[PDB]
Ligand SMILES: O=C1Cc2cc(Nc3nc(Cl)ncc3F)ccc2N1
């Protein structure tokens with residue numbers, strides 16, 4: 001086509017979606033990771049994670065307001081990945097990289113799994 | 125912080141949100157622009173438009189599944205702006221620029237209003 | 249704004 | 253991935 005494109009649009013959209021999350025505006029699901037609860041927007045979760053895409057495209061699960069993750073999932077790892085979904089920034093540290101990588105494999109977030117593998121290989 | 129950032133994340137999120145819209149997945153509102161209907165995600169509309177942000181933060185309107193726009197709004201202008209929200213690309217043409225600019229002023233999409241004003245000034 |  |  002003959003379209004023009006606003007370079008910062010996608011980043012500005014994501015920043016506003018994170019502001020809605022901060023302010024608990026139109027959040028429509030609670031993700032439970034053992035004793036912790038995280039509120040989010042189903043559409044953002046599906047856009048970022050192959051696991052959430054499969055969950056919320058299922059005719060029965062699409063209607064649930066609470067999703068319980070596998071008890072082996074670390075809440076801090078999940079929190080770091082949820083922040084990444086809404087900001088593009090990943091708080092990867094020596095003390096959390098194994099939990100983050102395990103959580104990203106479970107959530108099916110291939111680009112995160114890729115950077116974790118590279119950072120682990122560099123330390124070996 | 126000491127975060128790393130994935131450059132393409134925001135664009136990839138927006139591309140997936142547009143794929144959900146295409147496939148009518150988790151759309152939660154119908155916008156009516158005279159005889160036409162457009163399905164969308166409230167969160168994307170709020171993230172892009174000052175008018176939708178005000179509508180869906182209102183305690184009564186946040187619960188509506190149908191929103192009727194002012195009868196003066198052109199459906200093609202709205203369609204072009206809805207595509208811009210989900211893609212960052214604006215199909216601006218000599219034959220649609222006045223309707224697009226009028227619609228962006230109504231929806232409170234300041235960056236679009238800005239490029240329309242510049243393209244109009246260049247033709248004068 | 250750019251030409252994509 | 254980059255240093256933001
Ligand atoms: O590593 C990843 C990240 C990821 C996200 C999605 N999300 C969607 N995919 C499509 Cl094709 N349309 C809409 C979507 F919301 C699916 C698989 C995967 N795998």
Ligand SMILES: O=C1Cc2cc(Nc3nc(Cl)ncc3F)ccc2N1
Pocket residue numbers: 016017019020170171172173174175177232233234235
């Ligand atoms: O030209 C524009 C585009 C636009 C979008 C929004 N959207 C939101 N603003 C904030 Cl601060 N937090 C969350 C949002 F969804 C508000 C005003 C305006 N004006």
Ligand SMILES: [Cl-]
Pocket residue numbers: 048109110111112113
């Ligand atoms: Cl990813």
Ligand SMILES: [Cl-]
Pocket residue numbers: 172233234235236237
């Ligand atoms: Cl805009």
